[PDB]
Design a protein around this ligand. Structure first.
Ligand code: A1A2T
Length: 295
């Protein structure tokens, strides 16, 4: 549909971003595109720019949807959308820069304590409570999509996979996500709702405990099969966790969706009573940056 393409072309700003920004440094490179920091020639502001190759995404309505959801759902625990450009066959999305980097680096290079985990979970649940109240389901919660500020701020990004629900159509049915983090109702193609995000948050808490989601060593298709057959995953060493942390995990990773916590309910879970102030996260940031400086 050259209808879709024309809507994309009219959403973006015009001008050359290679002259509106400068000092490009590559900081990441997924299949979803390459990420650079840069500086706004006009403002001084540091920004993150995500370069997304269009020919990779045949369903352009997903790109539109990403930008539209981001601009419409502003929140302190969500990375801010700034602007977008079309540079030939690539879309550039300009976002606020968080200099503390990804929770992925923290969970792979450090051992978080329960108080720090509680703090991260509480900020993530705040983001989810906001989204879900606005009838938005993220569908791609994972450590990779949590960014940290140098003050210990915690923010969600990546609306590339999200869905909007209504009272008329309250459930989705697309098998979308990143396998290791996907709820069993999504993997097995049942109708599902916002609590799929809660499941994925539970898997992210397992990342913070163990360094990886369950089954990361397996290929993605095998991981889907394991999720379909095991349901609620097992920890390598459950006994090292507090009872209240175990209770929280169990409520996030309940097989029965009615029983699984909502974000609003999980914000009042006993485990969050031990959350530390966000300043407690700045040492993890320092450690992660030290560990990854020489990659
Ligand atoms: N998965 C994935 C992709 C990716 O590369 N994501 C990345 C987080 C990265 N690393 C760092 C490192 N130090 C700071 C920082 N800050 C940032 N603020 C704002 C940011 C923008 C993205 C909202 S990214 N990010 C860049 C790895 C592939 N496209 C998304």
């Amino acid at each position: 549909d050259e209808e879709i393409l024309e809507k994309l072309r009219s959403i973006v700003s015009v001008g050359d971003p290679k002259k509106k920004y400068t000092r490009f440094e590559k900081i990441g490179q997924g299949a979803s595109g390459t990420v650079y920091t840069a500086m706004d020639v006009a403002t001084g502001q540091e920004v993150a720019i995500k370069q997304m190759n269009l020919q990779q995404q045949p369903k352009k309505e997903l790109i539109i949807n990403e930008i539209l959801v981001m601009r419409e759902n502003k929140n302190p625990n969500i990375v801010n959308y700034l602007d977008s450009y079309l540079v030939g066959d690539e879309l550039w999305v300009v976002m606020e820069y968080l200099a503390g980097g990804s929770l992925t680096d923290v969970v792979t290079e450090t051992c978080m304590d329960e108080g720090q985990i509680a703090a991260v979970c509480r900020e993530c649940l705040q983001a989810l409570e906001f989204l879900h109240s606005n009838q938005v389901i993220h569908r791609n919660i994972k450590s990779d999509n949590i960014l940290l500020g140098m003050d210990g701020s915690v923010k969600l990004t990546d609306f590339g996979f999200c869905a909007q629900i209504t009272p008329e159509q309250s459930k989705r049915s697309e098998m979308v996500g990143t396998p290791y983090w996907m709820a069993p109702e999504v993997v097995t193609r049942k109708a599902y709702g916002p609590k799929v995000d809660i499941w994925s948050l539970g898997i992210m808490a397992i990342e913070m405990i163990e360094g990886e989601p369950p089954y990361l060593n397996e290929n993605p298709l095998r991981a889907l099969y394991l999720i379909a057959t095991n349901g609620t995953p097992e920890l390598q060493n459950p006994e090292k966790l507090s009872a209240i942390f175990r209770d929280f995990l169990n409520r996030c990773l309940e097989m029965d969706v009615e029983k699984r916590g909502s974000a609003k309910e999980l914000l009042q879970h006993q485990f969050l009573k031990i959350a530390k102030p966000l300043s407690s996260l700045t040492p993890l940031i320092a450690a992660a940056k030290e560990a990854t400086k020489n990659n």
